[PDB]
Write a protein that binds this ligand. Structure first.
Ligand SMILES: Cc1nsc(N2C[C@@H](C)O[C@@H](C)C2)n1
Lengths: 245, 179
């Protein structure tokens, strides 16, 4: 992540991020809504950072330092460029909505009142079709990626040295290769939990309550489509094992 | 320090997310309780052995039968949770959660954990459950379920007060270390 966004989302909550004199100007219900919207954006910033560790630290490091056989790096990191494009674009829209809402003279005091429309746009039309296609492919290649990683780490000395080197820093403690893969697979199922809690505190404006209700339904439709489109790929599985599913 | 992986499973109302949050911060949040838990790697020393224990939640995956099992590969210990304020969450342990975990995590120890133990003697909880001819789960009902399902053991905790939380994760670490 870049320092400007890390600092903007360093606090444990929106109520601790904004100036106390600004916090005291709002009702409790507004503070509750803003704290959950802040958690959705903060966790999206961290999810894009997980994807940057996968693309820049791991994938590109393996291409530039190691002599892996062709197709091995794509097998370890399936769909990572497509996932990075989807989420970096969504994060950009969330951060622009926050930036437009800032009070003049402030880089931290804002209230986001219209998140629903942004979520409907993300989870409908071509962006939802791309999210569905990409997660159905990524999640179906998840087992294969973990098995390929385990095989290389156990048998290739230069690969083991590379992994131990780039994951040594304390800031990578939660972000080894397998940990990144499962963080990405689990991201999509965090959205309904966050949206339902934002919706719980968004009854003040009926148009907002209706828009978040529509977005929650679109997210659950996307998850149902992805879940029905998954079948784990396995290296060496024979056609007979597949057609006898 | 050897690395081990823990996964918590249970119904949506079981308190698994809160349990992971309170353990990882050693604090029940005073200002904002997070809606979700990403992951965490805890440094734990149990009986003289140092372990890096990776923690994962299955919250949000309960309705997605092809996404949920992707959380299980190479798990070393399972915490299988129910809430003491919900006999319905305990009823779903033997029929749904246990056969799934035994299938995807063969031979992995399961610790059955009764969450929200502070609600066992909460008057509002007892009044609400009485309307459905129910009462909070008794300790013997938890132990009997753990015995029936082949659990490694039975433990209780309260994320709200932190009581019993450290003990659950230290025992999970000991179970993960066993051959
Ligand atoms: C979610 C899911 N996908 S397959 C599966 N099971 C496999 C089946 C043989 O036994 C049951 C107990 C668990 N469960």
């Amino acid at each position: 992540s870049m320092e400007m966004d890390e600092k903007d989302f360093a606090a444990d909550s929106w109520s601790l991020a904004v100036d106390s004199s600004f916090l005291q100007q709002h009702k409790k219900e507004v503070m509750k809504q803003q704290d959950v919207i802040y958690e959705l954006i903060q966790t999206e910033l961290h999810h894009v950072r997980t994807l940057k560790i996968m693309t820049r630290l791991f994938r590109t490091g393996m291409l530039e330092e190691l002599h892996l056989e062709p197709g091995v790096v794509q097998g370890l990191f399936p769909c990572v460029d497509e996932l990075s494009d989807i989420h970096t674009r969504f994060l950009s829209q969330l951060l622009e909505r926050r930036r437009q809402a800032l009070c003049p003279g402030s880089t931290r005091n804002f209230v986001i009142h219209r998140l629903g429309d942004l979520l409907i746009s993300q989870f409908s039309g071509p962006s939802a079709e791309q999210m569905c296609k990409t997660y159905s492919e990524f999640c179906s290649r998840h087992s294969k990626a973990l098995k390929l990683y385990k095989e290389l780490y156990a048998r290739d000395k230069r690969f083991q040295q590379f992994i131990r080197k780039v994951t040594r820093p304390a800031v990578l403690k939660r972000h080894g290769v397998q940990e990144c893969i499962l963080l990405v697979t689990q991201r999509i199922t965090k959205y309904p939990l966050l949206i339902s809690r934002i919706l719980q505190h968004s009854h003040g404006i009926e148009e907002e309550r209706q828009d978040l209700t529509t977005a929650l339904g679109l997210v659950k439709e996307l998850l149902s489509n992805v879940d029905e489109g998954i079948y784990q790929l396995e290296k060496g599985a024979r056609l007979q094992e597949i057609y006898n599913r | 320090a050897i690395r081990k992986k823990l996964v918590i499973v249970g119904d949506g109302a079981c308190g698994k997310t809160c349990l992971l949050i309170v353990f990882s911060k050693d604090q029940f949040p005073e200002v904002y309780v997070p809606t979700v838990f990403e992951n965490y790697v805890a440094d734990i020393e149990v009986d003289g052995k140092q372990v890096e224990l990776a923690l994962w939640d299955t919250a949000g995956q309960e309705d997605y039968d092809r996404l949920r099992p992707l959380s299980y590969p190479d798990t070393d210990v399972i915490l299988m949770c129910f809430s003491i304020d919900s006999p319905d969450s305990l009823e779903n342990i033997p029929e749904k959660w246990t056969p799934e975990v035994k299938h995807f995590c063969p031979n992995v120890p399961i610790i059955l954990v009764g969450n929200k133990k502070d609600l066992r003697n909460d008057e509002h909880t007892r009044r609400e459950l009485a309307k459905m001819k129910q009462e909070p789960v008794k300790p013997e009902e938890g132990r009997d379920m753990a015995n029936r399902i082949g659990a490694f053991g039975y433990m209780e905790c309260s994320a709200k007060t932190k009581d019993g939380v450290r003990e659950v994760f230290e025992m999970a670490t000991r179970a993960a270390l066993q051959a």
